Amino acid sequence: EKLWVTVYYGVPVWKEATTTLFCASDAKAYDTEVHNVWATHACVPTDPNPQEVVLENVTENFNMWKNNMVEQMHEDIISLWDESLKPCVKLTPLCVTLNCTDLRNVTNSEGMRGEIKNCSFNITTSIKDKVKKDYALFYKLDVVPIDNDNTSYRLINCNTSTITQACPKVSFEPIPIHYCTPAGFAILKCKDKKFNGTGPCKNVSTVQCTHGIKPVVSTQLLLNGSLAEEEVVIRSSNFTDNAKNIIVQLKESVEINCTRPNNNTRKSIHIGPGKAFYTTGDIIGDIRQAHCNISRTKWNNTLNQIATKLKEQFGNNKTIVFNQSSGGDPEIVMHSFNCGGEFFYCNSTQLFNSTWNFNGTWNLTQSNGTEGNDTITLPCKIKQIINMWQEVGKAMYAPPIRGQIRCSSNITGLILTRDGGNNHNNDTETFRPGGGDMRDNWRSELYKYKVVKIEPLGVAPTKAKRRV
């Protein structure tokens, strides 16, 4: 009846912990010397065989709203973008008055009202003796009207920031990134087919490396992210609080065919010593506004699904209403995202214009041929200058991509905001698209994961005793 203390190494014991993470992408990304990719340069090789040991009889608690990784990688990609554009040209001298024409010409039907602009000006290069008149092309989104003289204009964030162009060579296609942990640490995977994002997760496994995660950043619509399993799942910090954004992960991928149907010649003006400001030269042929293709029935069926889900969450006897963003910065008002590098601001008014009913939401939509579901086309714009989401400062210019651009993203998620307007005895719940926060677009991928250090040391009583 004598019990002595026995040391056991490698006990299955972990505790909550926050640590450094390191990227691992693909050997193929290194192949072909792509280089321009601003994120795979220092990534280690992804292990071809993943390790996903399953945990049995475990009910680990999870708080995706209090996830370290989210903030960790948020500042990681915030700094990673900064380091990529840090050696690139700072477009400080461009902050000049601009003489801007109609389009370029009146060679006229006419779906454009200033997108070319043809802003001309007098600028000084590294040669600090001669003014150098020239001209470049800018969408109205980048040219703020000044002086109201008629054609006086300046760059949008000259008096609020410093605009740095990306290095033209730099390609902006995200590739899957597998966060991996240093040894002695593990990632716990909440492998339940239905998680509120809060409370205990029963079905649970673990991985030493996260699954592939493209750091796609997009507002309102999550693109090329991750699909939900069997059912659409909605996660919020506090559903009844209006300020809290609403994560909505779709179980169905929806194809969005976005393109820039303008053949563009690109002109590189030299400004400064070896610094070159890349700008559009002209557009070959007719200019057609950028558009995105959305299946009506597929989208309406997804709408029906999320509507039933929000009714289940709130009141199944409530009316659901879908309006567009009240107002504020363009990113939140209209669906914005990068395509082949150029950024498209699509007026997603039609996407959120349908109101359902507790009495309604009874049937789905069935297309009667292709011309029945003629795909909705979204009025899309192009904004070359983007200020950092966190700070108006350090705005980044986007070099124009020559010729034709076309992408085919798969909508895997949605971001919503509930407005607590005076509709108490109305039950009419309105949800407006939200965004503007990279962290929200990461919470939608990191929720299933959780980092825990491993302390493989353990002690327990045993009748055994060390020999004297």
């Binding site: 019990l3 026995t6 490698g10 340069h41 040894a183 004297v468």
Partner: protein
């Protein structure tokens, strides 16, 4: 591979046989994989002063720190050997009221250590000082005689 995912199982069955085989698997694997990736990347010379490179360097330090602190502790209490060593330290009555079966066949490792946390420092200190000093005195006496 070999990650200890048997936290749900109590020390009653897994600790006796299954965990030790898995633990040896994990120790060999977490050594093979980490250093394989390291050697490959070091030869490539892709590792640099880049943001991600300083994250990898920081993690390379953490692995070393964790492994070395663990091995140090083990060697500082004589258990430089395998994962299972029996000390000459008695189990204090202050932590008790649980039968051998309770502790083993009824308490999962995670649940068990979560009640000993208030005494982890005391137990670890009273192991290293007791057995190690006593064994040093014994070796000296035997060598003298």
């Amino acid at each position: 591979l070999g990650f200890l995912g048997a936290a749900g199982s109590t020390m009653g069955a897994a600790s006796i046989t299954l965990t030790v085989q898995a633990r040896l698997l994990l120790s060999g694997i977490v050594q093979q994989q980490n250093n394989l990736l390291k050697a490959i990347e070091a030869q490539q010379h892709l590792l640099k002063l880049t943001v991600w490179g300083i994250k990898q360097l920081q993690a390379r330090v953490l692995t070393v720190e964790r492994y070395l602190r663990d091995q140090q502790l083990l060697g500082i209490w004589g258990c430089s050997g395998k994962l299972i060593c029996t000390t000459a330290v008695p189990w204090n009555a202050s932590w008790s009221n649980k039968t051998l079966d309770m502790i083993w066949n009824n308490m999962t490792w995670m649940e068990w250590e979560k009640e000993i946390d208030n005494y982890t420092g005391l137990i670890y200190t009273l192991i290293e000082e007791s057995q190690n000093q006593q064994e040093k005195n014994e070796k000296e006496l035997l060598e003298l005689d």
